[PDB]
Amino acid sequence: TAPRVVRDRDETNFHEMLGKFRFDLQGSFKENGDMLRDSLLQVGRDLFLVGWVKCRSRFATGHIQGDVHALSYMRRYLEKHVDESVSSVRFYEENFGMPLLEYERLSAVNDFRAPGKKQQH
Amino acid sequence: IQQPVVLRVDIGLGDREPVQDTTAFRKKQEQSRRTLQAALDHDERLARYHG
Amino acid sequence: YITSANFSEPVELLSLAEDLHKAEIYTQTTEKLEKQWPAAGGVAKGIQGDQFFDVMAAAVREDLQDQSRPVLVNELTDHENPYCMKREALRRLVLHACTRNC
Amino acid sequence: KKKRGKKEKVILNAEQVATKTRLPPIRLEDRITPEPPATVARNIRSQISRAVAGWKTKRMFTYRNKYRLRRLVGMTHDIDGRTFVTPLTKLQHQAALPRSPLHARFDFPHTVHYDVFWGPPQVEEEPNKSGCWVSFRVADLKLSDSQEQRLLDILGPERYDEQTGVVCLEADVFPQLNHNAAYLGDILQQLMREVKK
Amino acid sequence: PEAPQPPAGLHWSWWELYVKGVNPEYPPRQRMFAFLTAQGVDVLEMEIREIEDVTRWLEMSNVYGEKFPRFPYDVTFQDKIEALKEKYPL
Amino acid sequence: LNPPPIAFPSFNRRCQKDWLARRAFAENEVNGRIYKNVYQNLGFKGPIPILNKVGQYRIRMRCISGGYSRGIFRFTRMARMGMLQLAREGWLKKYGYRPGLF
Amino acid sequence: AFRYRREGQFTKFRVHFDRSGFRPYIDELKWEIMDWHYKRAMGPQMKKTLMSYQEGSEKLQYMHDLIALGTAKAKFPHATKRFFFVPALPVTIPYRRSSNPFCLLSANKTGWLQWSPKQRVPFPQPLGKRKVGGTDPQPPVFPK
RNA sequence: UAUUGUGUUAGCAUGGUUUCGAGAACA
């Protein structure tokens, strides 16, 4: 687990680093956010996403991790290239350069609560 | 200072009619085989590399 | 890298002058030969006629192309189709150091 | 706990002399070789004599009755060296072949169709890729009234379409494409020889 | 060290290496090549399934000794050698 | 821990015995038709004891990544666990396998 | 009535395996899965042996050319590189010599193919946290 | 184109993969 202090430069290692994404969406969505979740999953597979994501009617956040260069494209896609209406984009934290990764597969957390408890809640 | 090859010889042509499979070619093969065995005799980090 | 035949620099030198540079020479030679050695008509019609001056001219072109086929160093398949030789030449160079992501 | 209690070798008496001295009986592993023609005939003679000895079954007499039926209608090889000519070889001898590409063999339109498989290098060959058939229209082919009827009778109504009026002849009795293709061209010429009579 | 491979057309033939037993390094096959070659049989043009079948008998009759040539239908080991020779003359 | 290496099955005496009968039947397949032809011509029905040990029906389905002789299909040639491991390792995608549909 | 959504229903439950356009897939995978392990175990090993003796590696190749062709066609002076050895492995898949001019292996005149020293897109991509079988030489250990 | 033993005590209370039975997923 050698840090970037060993010899990363602009020759060949400039595109050999990992990190975490930074995004926090907020605003109303069509139906219950089904369109946004489906669109994000298809694009995420092409970029070989590892982290997870959360989608809902209003709340939309998550933690996405991957390559330093791969995540750069997603920043522009999820800021202007949005078919739905977006109010504003927030940020929580970011970090570039880290040995190995935490997650292994891309998945979206969905509300699988039973319908019986929905009325009580 | 830096050019390894003076020029190119890319000319469209076939080849000669005779085949290099005469008795002279076969006889020369035995001579080129003795040097291989003689070199392998002087064992220097080469005997195991080939075998 | 004690030896001079295994460094990163020499590998690139032989990957351009023998893979792409040699492929272009064969490509132009094949096209040039067809211009100076035409046929009576369509290639399909020439086989159904069994006429002279067509079987002879075609045979000469086959030997000329075979003798004008450079031997690739990096590639050992030794493809005979000029279209495939150029297509595969770029794939080897692109996969060496061209890409920057998965 | 179980399936572990061993037993001593009780086979030690001097009376058991004929043991561990010869190879065991024929094993299934040695059956790879084929049976010679001398042994196959021997079993037929041994079994035929046992059945007639009195070993009869309820389902044995019924089989004989069916065989006797084919004798009356005349579908048996029963007669109250030879060197014959096979039908395939006979057709080869009688065949007018063309003398070079510029000579027309047939004198009527005909279409030849065949399926050719192309793709990446497959480890195994794809079957059902050796079909060859020929089609021709009876209306275009000029023939007499008697000759026209015989053409459809030999091939039957299955190989004839009443809507358009075309006859399709399919031949596929060989695995190879080249072998099958040549076979179709031989039978086609023979058909016309008998039709015109 | 290693023998050459002068095939027809190309310059490499894996079939001759396997039958000779030089590449596989199989002692049972190496001794089999010198035996069939002396008998006068075209081993170079034999099927893959038949070469191994004959080689199995040579090793089986060697370790246990030449004392169990038994075969189904009362067949001797010499009959197979003679039969194969006719189909593969020299 | 470490899922099995699906390319090389473990040892199994029963599994090897099934393949042994296949070779015996193939060589004796010609003799099987001769026995039926002689009886048909003579018009007599009789048994063929020699076909018991070299019969086609002696062989049955078996699992290649296994050794059980039940629960094997002609399409997959694998047991319940054999297909699950093969499909979950990412090997059937190239062969048109979409698990999305039920 | 959904026509496109119900496509292929007829040839799913009312068709025989031998009377359909579907081709088998087990035959191809038989020779494909086995070859993957061969290149993995023998891949690094072949490269290690080639790089074991850095200098004096071209002497053996130069002498060999004097016996096959006699005259060294690729001869060059001392101030020029001879060649670069590429670690290659033999072909084990019994491919058929098809007549496809656009094929990548039909025109193969040798029994050796190049091996990629580095790959960024592993073919055996897992669908989860499961690992690839036969990729753990060292035995495991338990806390005990 | 076959080739590195054991279809045997010992899995709920130390087990890797899979799964039945009960419970949960909200700001």
Side-chain angles (χ1 to χ4, degrees), chain A, chain B, chain C residues 1-83 85-102, chain D, chain E, chain F residues 1-14 16-102, chain G:
Chain A
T1 59
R4 71 166 172 79
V5 182
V6 286
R7 71 139 289 150
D8 289 352
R9 63 191 294 172
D10 63 347
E11 289 288 338
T12 58
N13 315 104
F14 196 82
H15 57 258
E16 298 210 322
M17 296 172 69
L18 303 104
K20 52 175 73 184
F21 201 54
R22 209 183 200 200
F23 81 112
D24 269 316
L25 270 288
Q26 50 173 117
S28 309
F29 297 126
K30 289 170 185 289
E31 296 193 330
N32 216 313
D34 296 283
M35 269 65 249
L36 189 70
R37 194 174 68 268
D38 189 21
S39 302
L40 199 138
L41 255 292
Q42 297 296 319
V43 69
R45 286 199 285 186
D46 293 5
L47 299 170
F48 295 88
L49 257 63
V50 195
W52 59 273
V53 73
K54 264 174 185 174
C55 190
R56 252 184 264 282
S57 176
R58 298 212 304 188
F59 275 39
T61 177
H63 186 285
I64 312 177
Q65 56 175 223
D67 303 358
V68 71
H69 203 78
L71 292 171
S72 194
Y73 290 103
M74 201 179 194
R75 200 174 292 205
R76 197 79 190 288
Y77 166 71
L78 212 77
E79 201 176 80
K80 279 98 196 192
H81 298 252
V82 183
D83 198 35
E84 302 181 63
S85 302
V86 172
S87 65
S88 191
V89 178
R90 226 191 72 82
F91 306 103
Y92 58 100
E93 191 255 322
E94 59 176 288
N95 170 51
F96 304 147
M98 47 182 287
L100 299 71
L101 288 180
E102 301 172 71
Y103 309 97
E104 217 74 58
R105 182 170 164 78
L106 175 61
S107 187
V109 185
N110 196 86
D111 197 357
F112 292 113
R113 65 185 160 156
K117 282 217 168 182
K118 287 192 177 181
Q119 190 183 281
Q120 192 168 93
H121 293 353
Chain B
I1 288 161
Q2 204 275 321
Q3 197 188 244
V5 197
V6 69
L7 260 174
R8 42 151 270 282
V9 292
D10 181 39
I11 293 161
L13 202 84
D15 208 355
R16 315 302 183 75
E17 61 180 0
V19 289
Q20 290 204 268
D21 199 12
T22 55
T23 311
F25 184 48
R26 174 158 81 84
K27 185 251 184 173
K28 196 252 178 71
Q29 278 192 326
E30 86 197 359
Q31 191 178 346
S32 192
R33 213 269 296 284
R34 292 166 191 157
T35 181
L36 213 171
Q37 199 198 335
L40 259 291
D41 295 339
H42 197 177
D43 180 31
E44 195 206 306
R45 299 185 277 204
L46 199 79
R48 296 293 189 197
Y49 177 74
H50 183 244
Chain C
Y1 36 76
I2 305 301
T3 186
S4 50
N6 283 323
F7 208 62
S8 40
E9 268 69 2
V11 173
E12 272 269 35
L13 261 289
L14 66 101
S15 173
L16 179 66
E18 291 82 359
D19 285 302
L20 274 163
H21 205 246
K22 282 187 169 288
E24 193 69 72
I25 293 284
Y26 179 53
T27 310
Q28 300 301 307
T29 314
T30 315
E31 194 169 51
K32 189 249 186 178
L33 284 163
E34 191 171 1
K35 293 193 293 189
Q36 58 163 220
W37 285 108
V43 59
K45 201 77 75 168
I47 314 309
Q48 302 177 253
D50 291 7
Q51 205 181 243
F52 218 72
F53 195 85
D54 301 344
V55 292
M56 182 265 184
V60 177
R61 207 191 306 94
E62 293 284 0
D63 283 13
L64 289 163
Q65 289 174 13
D66 288 355
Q67 292 291 328
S68 194
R69 203 197 306 184
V71 182
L72 297 166
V73 191
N74 202 40
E75 176 168 317
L76 275 81
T77 312
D78 190 39
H79 292 105
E80 67 188 26
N81 199 27
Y83 166 70
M85 287 184 77
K86 205 174 202 178
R87 189 171 206 274
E88 284 180 41
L90 294 164
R91 189 176 292 171
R92 297 172 194 286
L93 197 139
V94 171
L95 259 63
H96 203 340
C98 197
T99 65
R100 58 130 178 280
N101 289 118
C102 187
Chain D
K1 202 190 192 184
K2 294 189 175 185
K3 209 84 81 73
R4 190 52 49 82
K6 65 188 289 187
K7 210 79 75 166
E8 298 85 350
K9 200 174 186 182
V10 298
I11 310 102
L12 285 164
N13 196 13
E15 188 167 14
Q16 294 156 323
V17 72
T19 185
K20 214 165 182 179
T21 53
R22 261 204 178 194
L23 208 72
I26 50 160
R27 193 165 147 257
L28 199 137
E29 199 165 74
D30 308 338
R31 281 181 176 277
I32 295 162
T33 59
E35 163 159 84
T39 318
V40 70
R42 196 200 74 96
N43 286 358
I44 308 307
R45 299 203 310 283
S46 67
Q47 287 212 130
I48 200 80
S49 178
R50 192 185 170 193
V52 302
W55 297 81
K56 316 301 184 163
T57 85
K58 279 203 213 91
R59 61 171 62 187
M60 191 172 283
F61 290 85
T62 59
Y63 196 84
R64 193 73 175 170
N65 290 331
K66 294 171 186 176
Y67 194 83
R68 266 190 290 273
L69 187 71
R70 301 287 271 196
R71 154 168 268 192
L72 194 79
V73 292
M75 287 184 158
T76 324
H77 307 123
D78 306 342
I79 312 306
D80 177 40
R82 178 175 274 171
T83 311
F84 83 103
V85 186
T86 52
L88 283 172
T89 51
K90 182 169 182 170
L91 181 61
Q92 276 182 334
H93 207 298
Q94 300 196 289
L97 270 65
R99 306 206 79 263
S100 268
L102 205 53
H103 299 63
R105 178 58 264 162
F106 303 120
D107 56 310
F108 63 98
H110 49 267
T111 58
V112 174
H113 306 88
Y114 45 87
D115 298 11
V116 193
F117 161 67
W118 273 304
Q122 200 166 315
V123 70
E124 288 269 35
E125 187 173 69
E126 185 176 20
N128 307 348
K129 295 292 189 181
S130 187
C132 286
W133 52 95
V134 69
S135 307
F136 56 92
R137 196 190 299 277
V138 290
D140 194 17
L141 188 74
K142 309 300 184 173
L143 281 170
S144 182
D145 180 39
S146 186
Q147 289 164 349
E148 183 178 1
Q149 279 284 303
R150 283 201 189 171
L151 183 64
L152 305 177
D153 192 17
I154 293 158
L155 309 183
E158 301 94 40
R159 302 177 197 277
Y160 170 59
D161 190 9
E162 207 169 31
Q163 291 186 355
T164 53
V166 290
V167 173
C168 185
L169 274 166
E170 69 93 39
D172 198 347
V173 295
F174 294 106
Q176 302 195 356
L177 181 62
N178 287 21
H179 296 176
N180 191 29
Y183 178 74
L184 182 63
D186 295 343
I187 57 166
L188 179 59
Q189 195 172 17
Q190 194 68 65
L191 179 61
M192 289 189 291
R193 288 172 154 279
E194 264 73 3
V195 170
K196 288 169 187 158
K197 279 192 173 185
Chain E
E2 208 71 58
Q5 294 150 78
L10 310 180
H11 218 275
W12 213 262
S13 171
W14 288 104
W15 174 252
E16 77 194 49
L17 307 182
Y18 148 75
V19 74
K20 286 182 175 183
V22 303
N23 183 274
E25 204 169 61
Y26 202 57
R29 268 188 286 279
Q30 291 175 357
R31 287 180 282 92
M32 189 221 65
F33 187 80
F35 171 64
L36 289 175
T37 43
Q39 295 292 328
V41 305
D42 190 22
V43 73
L44 277 160
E45 298 205 328
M46 285 189 185
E47 279 277 79
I48 196 170
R49 60 168 61 184
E50 295 173 2
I51 291 159
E52 290 295 316
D53 186 47
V54 182
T55 320
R56 276 174 58 265
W57 309 127
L58 204 78
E59 196 70 30
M60 190 177 93
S61 190
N62 181 250
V63 172
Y64 304 108
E66 293 184 284
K67 205 158 280 186
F68 290 112
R70 194 162 163 274
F71 280 103
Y73 319 111
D74 195 357
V75 172
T76 73
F77 187 55
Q78 203 169 247
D79 298 277
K80 290 293 198 175
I81 292 158
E82 190 171 343
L84 206 79
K85 191 166 180 172
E86 185 168 21
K87 197 173 177 179
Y88 305 95
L90 254 67
Chain F
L1 192 143
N2 199 73
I6 188 153
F8 301 92
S10 188
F11 188 79
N12 196 290
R13 181 65 184 180
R14 284 150 286 103
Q16 291 185 10
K17 207 187 191 178
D18 184 76
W19 183 88
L20 179 56
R22 294 170 187 275
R23 194 169 179 168
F25 164 68
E27 197 70 36
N28 286 288
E29 193 169 37
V30 188
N31 302 352
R33 308 302 182 80
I34 295 164
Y35 267 108
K36 297 161 186 183
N37 188 66
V38 68
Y39 295 144
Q40 277 191 271
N41 279 264
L42 287 161
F44 159 70
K45 189 182 181 81
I48 300 164
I50 203 169
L51 281 171
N52 189 21
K53 315 301 172 174
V54 296
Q56 194 202 339
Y57 311 130
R58 202 183 183 79
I59 299 130
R60 279 208 173 285
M61 298 277 260
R62 276 196 171 278
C63 176
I64 68 188
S65 300
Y68 222 71
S69 186
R70 292 196 166 80
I72 309 105
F73 292 93
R74 209 162 60 89
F75 195 85
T76 58
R77 309 190 181 164
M78 283 184 185
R80 304 175 196 192
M81 306 305 289
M83 198 73 179
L84 190 86
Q85 195 194 344
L86 192 79
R88 283 187 170 205
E89 276 188 41
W91 283 93
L92 312 181
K93 198 182 75 165
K94 186 158 66 173
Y95 300 92
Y97 169 66
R98 296 303 308 161
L101 271 76
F102 275 68
Chain G
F2 306 97
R3 179 174 159 173
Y4 285 114
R5 196 165 72 162
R6 306 190 305 211
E7 274 187 309
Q9 282 189 1
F10 179 71
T11 65
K12 193 177 179 183
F13 306 130
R14 299 204 293 150
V15 81
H16 282 64
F17 183 50
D18 294 292
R19 300 283 291 179
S20 194
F22 224 103
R23 294 184 297 92
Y25 85 105
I26 202 78
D27 297 313
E28 199 169 9
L29 190 67
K30 191 194 289 184
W31 304 98
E32 191 168 55
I33 196 163
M34 275 181 70
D35 195 64
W36 181 84
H37 291 93
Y38 183 70
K39 289 192 175 85
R40 194 178 184 80
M42 300 283 105
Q45 189 165 66
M46 183 178 178
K47 194 169 179 178
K48 182 168 182 180
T49 322
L50 190 80
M51 294 287 163
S52 65
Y53 187 29
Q54 293 279 294
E55 64 183 68
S57 183
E58 304 104 314
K59 185 61 168 174
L60 296 169
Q61 202 273 0
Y62 165 66
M63 293 161 80
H64 268 298
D65 197 9
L66 257 69
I67 312 179
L69 310 180
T71 59
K73 287 181 174 289
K75 211 173 188 187
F76 273 111
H78 205 75
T80 309
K81 270 67 178 178
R82 289 200 73 262
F83 283 112
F84 169 58
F85 296 120
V86 172
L89 302 173
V91 193
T92 63
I93 308 106
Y95 282 117
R96 260 192 152 201
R97 281 187 178 285
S98 68
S99 66
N100 190 12
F102 294 98
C103 175
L104 281 90
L105 257 67
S106 296
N108 188 24
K109 301 228 192 85
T110 187
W112 267 272
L113 258 70
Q114 85 307 321
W115 180 64
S116 183
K118 192 179 179 181
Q119 296 180 348
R120 308 194 79 138
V121 175
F123 175 54
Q125 184 169 58
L127 268 289
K129 275 179 178 181
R130 291 185 69 154
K131 306 301 184 182
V132 191
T135 64
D136 196 350
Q138 56 170 26
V141 64
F142 320 110
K144 115 183 191 173

